[PDB]
Write a new protein. Structure first.
Length: 266
């Protein structure tokens, strides 16, 4: 019944619509959570480097479930990562060679022959982007591909890649003109579970805070599950408890309830 972990999604949850949060209030709150030995976790679809930019003073202290569970960090150190074999990366790239970025542990990668305009645009989206001559030559392992193409081609390319890369990777739509290739069995919720196992804690000790469809599993999992006021009704139905919306510090108010030991933590 004791709160030992607070986990939050970012977009639509810990962040307002302006993609910011009350940093001074959260700092003071975190100082207090640390005194009580309560872990704070950010769990999101977002890139690890996009998550930690929000926490420059806490990034080696709090924990991250990034890239929907393909990357897990605890005390500033990588605890878990997904990866493809040299074999599977070869297979994937073969199929793509019929513009893309490959995501590795140390860098993102693009072909040196890829259109220069595309390479310049990608450079803005990744913390590090390395032009490479050969994908079988790079010393990294890969967990994700991002593909850019005319959006009209997307439904057919998804169908093609779904069968062709079955059991290796799953194609999903991302933004306008983009497809992600993701490792199929890696999810936000099982990324969180990896942290719980490391800490010898149970989902019964967990506060989870979310708003969006991809928060459903994490919310089902946690004993103290909270849907943001802006959450769709289906998410509000899954979560046991409610809080104010993301433009009114709703996630911080949950943390406040834990600190106050008020309901449902009383």
């Amino acid at each position: 019944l004791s709160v030992k972990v607070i986990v939050t999604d970012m977009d639509g949850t810990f962040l307002n619509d302006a993609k910011t949060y009350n940093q001074p209030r959260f700092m003071a709150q975190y100082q207090e959570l640390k005194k009580r030995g309560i872990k704070f976790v950010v769990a999101s679809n977002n890139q690890y480097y996009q998550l930690i930019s929000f926490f420059p003073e806490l990034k080696d202290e709090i924990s991250f479930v990034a890239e929907n569970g393909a990357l897990v960090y605890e005390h500033g150190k990588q605890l878990f990562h997904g990866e493809l074999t040299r074999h599977e990366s070869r297979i994937v790239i073969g199929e793509l060679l019929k513009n893309f970025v490959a995501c590795g542990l140390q860098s993102a990668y693009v072909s040196e022959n890829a259109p220069e305009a595309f390479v310049a645009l990608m450079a803005k989206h990744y913390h590090r982007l390395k032009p490479v001559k050969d994908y079988q030559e790079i010393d990294d392992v890969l967990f994700k591909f991002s593909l850019n193409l005319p959006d009209e081609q997307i439904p057919l390319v998804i169908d093609k890649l779904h069968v062709a890369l079955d059991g290796i990777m799953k194609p999903v739509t991302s933004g306008f003109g983009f497809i992600d290739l993701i490792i199929p069995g890696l999810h936000k919720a099982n990324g969180i579970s990896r942290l719980l196992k490391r800490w010898d804690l149970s989902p019964q000790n967990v506060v989870a805070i979310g708003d969006s469809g991809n928060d459903a599993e994490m919310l089902k999992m946690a004993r103290y599950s909270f849907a943001m006021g802006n959450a769709a009704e289906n998410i509000k139905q899954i979560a046991r408890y409610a809080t104010d919306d993301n433009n009114h510090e709703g996630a911080l108010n949950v943390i406040q309830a834990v600190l106050d030991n008020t309901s449902p933590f009383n």
